[PDB]
Design a protein around this ligand. Structure first.
Ligand SMILES: Nc1nc2c(ncn2[C@@H]2O[C@@H]3COP(=O)(O)O[C@H]4[C@@H](O)[C@H](n5cnc6c(=O)[nH]c(N)nc65)O[C@@H]4COP(=O)(O)O[C@H]3[C@H]2O)c(=O)[nH]1
Ligand SMILES: Nc1nc2c(ncn2[C@@H]2O[C@@H]3COP(=O)(O)O[C@H]4[C@@H](O)[C@H](n5cnc6c(=O)[nH]c(N)nc65)O[C@@H]4COP(=O)(O)O[C@H]3[C@H]2O)c(=O)[nH]1
Ligand SMILES: Nc1nc2c(ncn2[C@@H]2O[C@@H]3COP(=O)(O)O[C@H]4[C@@H](O)[C@H](n5cnc6c(=O)[nH]c(N)nc65)O[C@@H]4COP(=O)(O)O[C@H]3[C@H]2O)c(=O)[nH]1
Ligand SMILES: [Mg+2]
Length: 172
């Protein structure tokens, strides 16, 4: 069968589910603020080159399961790209959204991925942005992407926030 609302590998909803639902989610976030958390597996190409793509698939499937287990039910985890996940967070303020982001980064770092021949330690870099009313998804992801990139530049295994001045800081 063809199930366009599910990533076959991880079982998570994919890009199309977020793209199609984002405007609705943002409209109905009130009275809360909506935040977008973009997560990329650190040096994932290297994992595949070292262990092979079958093991890479285990990493993706396991991380998906982990993220699902580490998030609240109304905050959906998507597999947005090949090595990229998105979590849509609703929160009262920036500090709460950033706490969600940094705790998820910390959990990833602290839970090895079991595979047949041992264990692999992975980390993620995360960028978080507020979605302002009526903004399209590409703008929100664009800003989170800037935050995430600065995270990769400054050491990886961390969560970054881009604020209302479009200035990026690491979340501690
Ligand atoms: N550190 C931290 N982690 C958070 C927070 N919100 C969600 N999580 C994480 O997301 C997982 C799933 O949350 P849930 O579906 O709401 O499902 C939760 C929730 O229904 C409940 N629960 C656990 N602790 C609390 C709590 O302190 N307050 C409330 N109201 N419920 C809790 O038990 C379920 C399973 O909890 P966990 O195994 O801990 O698993 C939690 C935890 O890993 C948070 O604010 N801080
Ligand atoms: N093992 C595995 N790696 C993947 C998969 N999709 C993407 N990748 C990895 O993620 C990197 C980026 O993929 P792109 O963003 O689609 O280069 C790829 C590859 O290393 C997959 O389905 N399985
Ligand atoms: N929307 C959203 N907000 C998040 C998430 N994670 C953290 N926050 C926000 O950050 C506040 C502090 O989280 P914390 O330091 O983990 O501090 C948390 C944590 O120690 C615990 N807690 C709450 N829920 C859970 C849970 O489901 N599992 C576990 N293990 N602890 C929880 O209670 C403390 C207070 O929780 P809150 O009053 O809810 O207050 C939370 C909440 O407003 C998230 O995944 N989604
Ligand atoms: Mg749950």
């Amino acid at each position: 069968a063809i199930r366009s609302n599910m990533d076959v590998l991880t079982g998570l909803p994919g890009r199309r589910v977020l793209d199609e639902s984002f405007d609705h989610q943002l409209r109905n976030a009130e009275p809360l603020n909506l935040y977008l958390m973009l997560l990329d597996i650190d040096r994932f190409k290297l994992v595949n080159d070292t262990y092979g793509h079958l093991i890479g698939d285990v990493v993706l499937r396991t991380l998906a399961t982990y993220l699902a287990s580490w998030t609240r039910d109304y905050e959906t985890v998507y597999r947005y790209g090949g090595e990229e996940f998105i979590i849509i967070v609703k929160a009262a303020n920036d500090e709460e959204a950033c706490r969600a982001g940094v705790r998820i980064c910390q959990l990833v770092d602290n839970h090895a991925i079991t595979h047949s021949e041992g264990h692999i330690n992975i980390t993620v870099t995360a960028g978080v942005s507020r979605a302002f009313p009526e903004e399209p998804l590409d703008v929100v992801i664009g800003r989170a992407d800037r935050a995430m990139y600065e995270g990769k530049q400054t050491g990886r295994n961390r969560c970054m926030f881009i604020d209302e001045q479009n200035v990026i800081n690491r979340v501690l």
